[PDB]
Amino acid sequence: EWSYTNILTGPETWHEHYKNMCSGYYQSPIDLKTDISTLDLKLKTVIIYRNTSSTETTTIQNNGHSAEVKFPRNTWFISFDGILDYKYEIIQMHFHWGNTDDRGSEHTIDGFRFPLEGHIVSFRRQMYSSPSEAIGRPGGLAVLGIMHQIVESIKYEQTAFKAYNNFSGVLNSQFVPPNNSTIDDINLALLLSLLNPSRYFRYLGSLTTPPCTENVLWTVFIDPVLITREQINLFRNLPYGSNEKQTRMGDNFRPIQLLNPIDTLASRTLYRATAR
Ligand SMILES: *[C@@H]1O[C@H](CO)[C@@H](O[C@@H]2O[C@H](CO)[C@@H](O)[C@H](O)[C@H]2NC(C)=O)[C@H](O)[C@H]1NC(C)=O
Ligand SMILES: [Zn+2]
Ligand SMILES: [Zn+2]
Ligand SMILES: [Zn+2]
Ligand SMILES: [Zn+2]
Ligand SMILES: [Zn+2]
Ligand SMILES: [Zn+2]
């Protein structure tokens, strides 16, 4: 019973209706301000890698809040240390977009919004057994933020949707909550190859939907990948759930939180990584 577009249940009210932890002071998203961040040269190239023995199918769903891809377990992994040892396991990827092309992202970079931001959501497997072990425990989750930029005269194999395999055509008016659906696997490593994975912001924050748990190690890449107007619009075709005042899914993004609200009891820092 939280929403984006229903003013009685909308984001301004989350800190009240879900105090744990939407009222905390390590919230996301934030404005990633290049000039107010500490470069940390010890932060390494992000690697995404697959368990090739995994053969289980990949699905997608309209959950009422986003278009969410649910990946099978033991399939997709993140490494932040160059070691391929299954420390972080990808669970799910979802998206945040606007009603118009000029907004939709949750994070901004130096004040700039983007039309679409994806989240690849993983659990700290080195510490926790399963996704549901992780989701509510401290230091449980690591999420990647991927910016998308709208481009016009471009070949399809150079857009993100190639990596998404175009969501196996599943995106349309018909796709309704909570109807799941089978698709071909997203090539996440290809997706990553389309930006620069040594260049990102890094900080401790939260889930950007209630209950806003403060257990996300955030990584947001600096360089956007590319989409067409045709491509973005397939998103706006999905219907929202019953809880929303708007009909067509959009503006499903949370307003900007402060890095350090004045009532914080231990400030946090925004870090930034760069190549070689
Ligand atoms: C890679 O995937 C394989 C196959 O999906 C995983 O092995 C299976 O899952 C568990 C082992 O933990 C057992 O129930 C089965 O004996 C295995 N079955 C198959 C199909 O081989 C494997 O553990 C995965 N590896 C990682 C690191 O996640
Ligand atoms: Zn809900
Ligand atoms: Zn209040
Ligand atoms: Zn600068
Ligand atoms: Zn829900
Ligand atoms: Zn998200
Ligand atoms: Zn065109």
PDB file of N, CA, C and O and ligand atoms in Angstrom, residues 1-2 61 63-65 68 209-210 243, ligand 5:
ATOM      1  N   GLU A   1       0.866  -1.233   0.000  1.00  0.00           N
ATOM      2  CA  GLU A   1       0.000   0.000   0.000  1.00  0.00           C
ATOM      3  C   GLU A   1       0.879   1.252   0.000  1.00  0.00           C
ATOM      4  O   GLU A   1       0.507   2.283   0.554  1.00  0.00           O
ATOM      5  N   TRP A   2       2.057   1.147  -0.622  1.00  0.00           N
ATOM      6  CA  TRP A   2       2.832   2.327  -0.971  1.00  0.00           C
ATOM      7  C   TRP A   2       2.717   2.534  -2.473  1.00  0.00           C
ATOM      8  O   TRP A   2       2.519   1.575  -3.219  1.00  0.00           O
ATOM      9  N   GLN A  61       8.365 -10.071 -15.131  1.00  0.00           N
ATOM     10  CA  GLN A  61       7.133  -9.888 -14.386  1.00  0.00           C
ATOM     11  C   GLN A  61       6.778  -8.407 -14.281  1.00  0.00           C
ATOM     12  O   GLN A  61       7.645  -7.547 -14.172  1.00  0.00           O
ATOM     13  N   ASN A  63       5.232  -6.279 -11.499  1.00  0.00           N
ATOM     14  CA  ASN A  63       5.016  -6.430 -10.064  1.00  0.00           C
ATOM     15  C   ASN A  63       4.127  -5.301  -9.548  1.00  0.00           C
ATOM     16  O   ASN A  63       3.962  -5.161  -8.341  1.00  0.00           O
ATOM     17  N   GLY A  64       3.583  -4.481 -10.455  1.00  0.00           N
ATOM     18  CA  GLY A  64       2.898  -3.254 -10.059  1.00  0.00           C
ATOM     19  C   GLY A  64       3.812  -2.030  -9.879  1.00  0.00           C
ATOM     20  O   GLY A  64       3.316  -0.904  -9.868  1.00  0.00           O
ATOM     21  N   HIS A  65       5.137  -2.230  -9.732  1.00  0.00           N
ATOM     22  CA  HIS A  65       6.077  -1.147  -9.419  1.00  0.00           C
ATOM     23  C   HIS A  65       7.110  -0.976 -10.541  1.00  0.00           C
ATOM     24  O   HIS A  65       7.454   0.144 -10.917  1.00  0.00           O
ATOM     25  N   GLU A  68      10.354  -6.332 -13.769  1.00  0.00           N
ATOM     26  CA  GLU A  68      11.414  -6.965 -13.002  1.00  0.00           C
ATOM     27  C   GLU A  68      11.771  -8.306 -13.630  1.00  0.00           C
ATOM     28  O   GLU A  68      10.899  -9.139 -13.805  1.00  0.00           O
ATOM     29  N   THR A 209      12.704   1.495  -2.812  1.00  0.00           N
ATOM     30  CA  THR A 209      11.287   1.245  -2.572  1.00  0.00           C
ATOM     31  C   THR A 209      11.103   0.863  -1.104  1.00  0.00           C
ATOM     32  O   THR A 209      12.008   0.307  -0.495  1.00  0.00           O
ATOM     33  N   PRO A 210       9.945   1.134  -0.466  1.00  0.00           N
ATOM     34  CA  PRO A 210       9.727   0.658   0.905  1.00  0.00           C
ATOM     35  C   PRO A 210      10.028  -0.843   0.986  1.00  0.00           C
ATOM     36  O   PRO A 210       9.788  -1.575   0.030  1.00  0.00           O
ATOM     37  N   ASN A 243      -2.949   0.351  -6.835  1.00  0.00           N
ATOM     38  CA  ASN A 243      -2.588   1.330  -5.823  1.00  0.00           C
ATOM     39  C   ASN A 243      -2.241   2.686  -6.451  1.00  0.00           C
ATOM     40  O   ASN A 243      -2.066   3.670  -5.718  1.00  0.00           O
TER      41      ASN A 243
HETATM   42 ZN    ZN B   5       5.120  -5.280  -4.352  1.00  0.00          ZN
END
